[PDB]
């Protein structure tokens, strides 16, 4: 079709929030994604939701790695001086293999990467959806903190519903409670610990249905039996390239796409254009469309439109280690048990007294330990083989201004090993907040292009001196101190800062504020691009503040608010 | 789910899809079970590399393969970690941990062997090479009449090739492909012939190849449907097939016991015909879990009741691998027909050729692509266009070089990524040796240890046989070193090496075919029917009883087609 | 020698080293010169190399010498993993 | 020529590496981007640690090194003393 009420670029969780809202409200919606349906019969669903992946969670790191394509790889300068004399040998470090010659390797976010599949990165994410407290969060209401808090509560509540956020899906994990209780005790009165809030529904003791874009909106074309009055079409393998501005710069007139299967290019018309292509690619599509400044920043000629586009970018510092559980904590697991005799032998019985007030642990815990120690008497640990992973956090606070995850999950790194029993291993990830600075930028080459023939992204980024840097190092030390209470570092996973941007929490590339000039921003609190009646941006690129927590829930909340504007200001076509 | 089908197939890989395609088409009521799930988009069982993104970022596809390959038998780990904090819990022994197999001798393993549980099986990830076996590598379907035998294999392979859409033309306009092909052709001339690797694939565009898969064989859609209103097929993903039930006389299978992994329910499914296409390892597992062969560590003093050759005479290929960096001479040859004046990057620079000159070394299409690359990309120091498709060259197995060869680029489990050398220069070398079948080389199943699906844990007892297998394997290494030198020197970091045993994933002979159970030490006859059993058939590389170097799937498909011929001759489809 | 990072898994009695040494044609353009600004640890002009193996005979032989080591070494044994055939740093 | 080295011959490599000082090390351009943000961090690949900025890393003899001990490299060498045939000889 040539004409829609709304077109949405990208099928990640944020595009899906606009689809859920606007498709539900009766709009003829088209959604385009440059990537394809892979994921199974549930379009855009979490790839970790297969029996095989949940039996072999360490293999999922491979899936993640296989769909994270680096944003900007500087030109390689490794010296290979052991080629055969007959082999063709370089005289210079020329531009090879997709590298970016615009990129200073020392001012990069080398770990930054993007995913191009239907459902975006929600096909592989780790589902942590905390709310930001005031300190981390931009204002949606000026001069009324209580009204501002109320608005965010209303939006986050809906967002949590859409993602199926919960804080009890790991409540009966031994490892989770083990870690939770010890940290709760150690910081008693000083910090609070809880389960990471997770966009997930537990289906069985050994299976968790992790949420994804599909959870937000199932991405099935409509009308269909289950929604005969709704109108939605998803078009995968369509690279969206430009929004066409009118000469007056007050309205978008079309979206120019490239159908990657036929190879043909089309102009799609809509009343309302929503860009939810991610924090990098939203900015890319805007710059390729005449917003901001194409090429190396040049203050001499400021751009015509959106001069803050691609400036004030933030990415979080991330420190990481893994620990091996202390003897003391492992011994405490079986503290309630009565242990008759010698394991393997007839004289082995393991029993406990349900409800005994002297017991350190609940009955659900002892029953599982007992059963494990009795079913597996050769095994030297008291933790059940199927015990779900820990999922503990102490949330960002002024006296510890970083987000924390004390957990086990699959990421692009954490290349786990086989010599140490996995039941012993806990991951530590602390996330710092980065002050937004005009000098930190994502820009796009006016000569170099990427694999889809669009302007090559280039970072110019350093963690700002002052608070960001002081905090990041204070965060490291906090991780070293806190993790030492649970066990010592796992060799091969010693405490370290991760490559800039590997954390994938980039924000502020197309930031939100109330006033374009005063707040140095690109979209207002309805996520509308300043000056344009019908152009909206969604995603973490909107977030203008220094945040430690995981941003997606916050980007979703902004999107819900955006949709309220859209619904108030545009009327659906007749069906 | 019904209680009753005409045919049930275990496994939705390309071999199971061969039985589905034949049997569904002939009007049988078919059910197919796979323990894994739908994972390749809307085209069920399709090749996961058929995305625009993967074909633009082909190095990334290694991670997909690695993510779905689950190792078969991992010996207990004895790595010393002695720098734990004194507070951390520490083992006193190297105990059974993290899924490891205490049965497995680490020194007599196929440590690289791995399986994939996804609908479409390993054909969601494979490299699509589908050569025929020559007589030397191939089991006999007709004894004492080599022309009847040749005629039967030709008919079956031709059919197999249509199902896979095998061809040898998809890479014909690649400059790198032709550069290597013509060089090796000239250098060997009259000693070895070279051609494109036969590939199960159809090119869609200059930048995209639709790799074939199980889906290409059979689309895996439930039937009847608008397209196939008179066919009957249901696929049931996430169902672990556990045992076939023998009647008391051991002359028939009475049902298949399944475990639906989502609901946890268990059922006994009844069919006229039972087909096991669960792969070389898992077919054997299922059969042993059903009282065929011998459960547990082999014990010759307790000879099995049934199928004594089951899981013996296993073969797996020796694999040697390197990469090379293209010679300066060959790179200069790419631009042999060009006239180049001025200095690159200046407006006086030009690159031209004489179209049609019979003294041109290359054809016009080549020279135009070089011209355009050099004129539009004057900062680039190489003459090869950026999106030039990869080489896909082979000289097939012959008695004077008894190994298969691939001189190509592809995504495999071990395709480690380097960025210092331009990828246009890099060619992969994979030479694959044939392994003599020997009784002592075994896949067996623990009577104590179980796998992730609570089935008997697979254990290998394998070494490459002394004598011809070993001699060839090493002569194969040398051949790779000699041939490859003609194209370029090795790429540091990919020096010539034997790969981990079983990484190549060409295991055969676990349930091997022969004419006579005893005399040929085998488990199925040439209809792929299990000896003694009217209605049990095995399909897959497990059937192949010979020493082969070439990639085995086409051959197993051809056997599967023959097997279906017997089925159609002996079982009537139920009326619609 | 300076290279050879020790291994213990394979019995040393089995291990044999192969070192083949090529001859390099003398070319005027292959140079050792000394900086007029940078100095070394004893305050003398810093040595600098400008060197490549000459194309032509020197390169062709070096690669044929590689192939010859692979061919000859195979008569004695296969390569030790971790000491696979390689050109050493110039 | 110590009983200890000839009983532990793999350890002699370390003696060799210990006295071979590289002749020309080009300026280092390894990217270390996981420093703490509070650590002093370079804006350029400047001349560090004895490196030679005259040296093109791609036209070097990077393995060339010298020994500054009495007896020179003969304190470490492998003692192979073949004659040159005519072809190799001035
Ligand atoms: C391993 C991993 C772990 C993470 N875990 C956490 C976590 O626990 N919590 C947290 O909040 N976040 C986490 N994240 C980040 C989270 O996934 C993102 O913040 C979120 O997915 C962003 O949603 P989005 O819809 O804005 O964009 P994306 O999910 O990036 O999706 C946008 C999409 O647009 C498409 N697209 C891009 N360019 C174009 C174009 N030009 N034309 C058409 N389509 C286009 C894509 O193909 C893609 O599907 C994780 C990410 C990964 C990779
Ligand atoms: C990276 C890669 C490259 C390869 N390249 C080539 C090549 O170029 N040429 C070629 O000839 N071969 C190659 N192969 C090997 C080829 O993929 C296999 O030979 C082929 O897939 C075997 O087909 P099959 O149907 O017998 O088995 P599989 O493809 O292994 O399918 C068997 C299936 O049965 C299932 N299953 C297993 N156990 C059970 C059970 N108990 N219950 C129910 N279902 C079960 C699985 O989940 C699976 O889908 C390669 C393989 C890989 C992974
Ligand atoms: C591990 C090893 C293996 C080798 N194996 C072989 C082999 O088996 N066969 C063989 O032919 N070659 C071998 N060599 C090379 C051989 O060692 C040299 O060719 C030989 O030592 C050169 O002798 P020379 O006296 O000219 O120089 P050197 O041995 O280099 O001695 C020169 C000396 O002069 C000194 N010097 C340098 N500058 C000054 C200065 N400005 N003022 C005062 N003194 C100065 C030194 O400190 C030094 O002792 C080997 C070398 C090494 C290190």
Residue numbers in the entry:
A (entry chain B): 44 to 618
B (entry chain A): 43 to 618
C (entry chain C): 454 to 543
D (entry chain C): 92 to 181
Question: What text does the study give?
Answer:
In this context, Trametes multicolor pyranose 2-oxidase (TmP2O; EC 1.1.3.10; for a review, see) is of interest since it can oxidize both β-D-Glc and β-D-Gal to the corresponding 2-keto sugars, which are intermediates for production of D-fructose and D-tagatose. TmP2O is a homotetrameric enzyme produced by lignocellulolytic fungi and has been assigned a role in lignin degradation. The reaction catalyzed by TmP2O is of the ping-pong type involving a reductive and an oxidative half-reaction. Therefore, to evaluate and compare the productive and competing sugar-binding modes for oxidation of Glc and Gal, we used crystal-structure analysis of 2- and 3-fluorinated Glc and Gal derivatives bound to the TmP2O variants H167A, V546C, H450G and H450G/V546C.
The wild-type mimic, H167A, shows an impaired ability to bind 3FGal productively for C2 oxidation. Similar to sugar-free TmP2O structures, the H167A–3FGal complex has the Thr169 side chain hydrogen bonding to the flavin N(5)/O(4) locus. Clearly the 2-oxidation binding mode of Gal must be possible for H167A since Gal is turned over by TmP2O to produce the 2-keto product. We do not suggest that the absence of 3FGal in H167A implies that the sugar is unable to bind, but rather that it indicates that this binding mode is too unfavorable to be stably trapped in a crystal complex. To confirm this observation, we collected multiple data sets from H167A–3FGal crystals. Although the best ordered crystal included here corresponds to the H167A structure without bound sugar, two other data sets show evidence of partly occupied states of 3FGal that agree with the 3FGal-binding mode observed for the other variants (data not shown). In one of these data sets there is a nearly perfect 50∶50 composite electron-density map of the unbound occluded state and the 2-oxidation mode of 3FGal, and in another data set, the 3FGal-bound state is dominating with traces of the occluded state. For all the latter two cases, there are also varying relative ratios of the two states between different subunits in the homotetramer.
